[PDB]
Enzyme design. Structure first.
Site, PDB file in Angstrom:
ATOM      1  N   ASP A  37       0.817  -1.228   0.000  1.00  0.00           N
ATOM      2  CA  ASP A  37       0.000   0.000   0.000  1.00  0.00           C
ATOM      3  C   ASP A  37       0.819   1.231   0.000  1.00  0.00           C
ATOM      4  O   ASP A  37       1.331   1.739   1.041  1.00  0.00           O
ATOM      5  CB  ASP A  37      -0.836  -0.064   1.282  1.00  0.00           C
ATOM      6  CG  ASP A  37      -1.836   1.016   1.292  1.00  0.00           C
ATOM      7  OD1 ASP A  37      -1.878   1.962   0.462  1.00  0.00           O
ATOM      8  OD2 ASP A  37      -2.684   0.969   2.278  1.00  0.00           O
ATOM      9  N   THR A  38       0.999   1.842  -1.182  1.00  0.00           N
ATOM     10  CA  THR A  38       1.794   3.045  -1.316  1.00  0.00           C
ATOM     11  C   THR A  38       1.145   4.243  -0.672  1.00  0.00           C
ATOM     12  O   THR A  38       1.845   5.230  -0.456  1.00  0.00           O
ATOM     13  CB  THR A  38       2.099   3.366  -2.808  1.00  0.00           C
ATOM     14  OG1 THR A  38       0.872   3.521  -3.496  1.00  0.00           O
ATOM     15  CG2 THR A  38       2.908   2.271  -3.463  1.00  0.00           C
ATOM     16  N   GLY A  39      -0.150   4.166  -0.363  1.00  0.00           N
ATOM     17  CA  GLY A  39      -0.878   5.213   0.328  1.00  0.00           C
ATOM     18  C   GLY A  39      -0.748   5.170   1.835  1.00  0.00           C
ATOM     19  O   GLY A  39      -1.330   6.016   2.514  1.00  0.00           O
TER      20      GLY A  39
END
Ligand code: CL
Ligand code: CL
Ligand code: CL
Ligand code: CL
Ligand code: CL
EC number: 3.4.23.16
Lengths: 7, 99, 99
Positions: B25-27
């Protein structure tokens, strides 16, 4: 505060 | 690997000798996993997501394998809907976004 | 481009004639933008994540320019704490996770 966004 | 995004980017992780599924999850600034036992002392932390803020337990210097890559770093434990690998550990495994 | 993850992966987008900053978020199924007007019909939706759920408006067939790449798809509008580009549009710009 730190942010965690999955969705 | 090169992971496309037509499906959720779910991978196998290993923590405490046990396999689990987690989302790359880059967020996410941080790595958050569902309730489990981890060694050592923890510290309090508040994190914010799409629906508001939650309290979690912060464990430092935890050994975790992510899609076969070794990482050692901070793991948050709390009521997340899914196990999340965030940027703190994505950087340890050398992940980038490319387009 | 190759975007490292030492920092949040923020990019400029254009949507509805407006320039905004947004987070490239592999953990999000959907694209979610803070309150703004968009054309066409909409229908209500609930979306969830850390901290629970929020109610949003779902607009279909919306064009977005993401870091100079145009994409079309569904965009959700509502009280998100950050603008999110999720997988439904990341796929369209050819974004991959690499390690
Ligand atoms: Cl860390
Ligand atoms: Cl940042
Ligand atoms: Cl507006
Ligand atoms: Cl779509
Ligand atoms: Cl593709």
């Amino acid at each position: 505060y730190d942010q965690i966004x999955i969705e | 690997p090169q992971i496309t995004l037509w499906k959720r980017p779910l991978v196998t992780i290993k923590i405490g000798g046990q396999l689990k599924e987690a989302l790359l999850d880059t967020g996410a600034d941080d790595t958050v996993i569902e309730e489990m036992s981890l060694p050592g002392r923890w510290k309090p932390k508040m994190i914010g997501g799409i629906g508001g803020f939650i309290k979690v337990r912060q464990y430092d210097q935890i050994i975790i394998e992510i899609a076969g890559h070794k990482a050692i770093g901070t793991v948050l434990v709390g009521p997340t809907p899914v196990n999340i690998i965030g940027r703190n550990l994505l950087t340890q495994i050398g992940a980038t976004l490319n387009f």
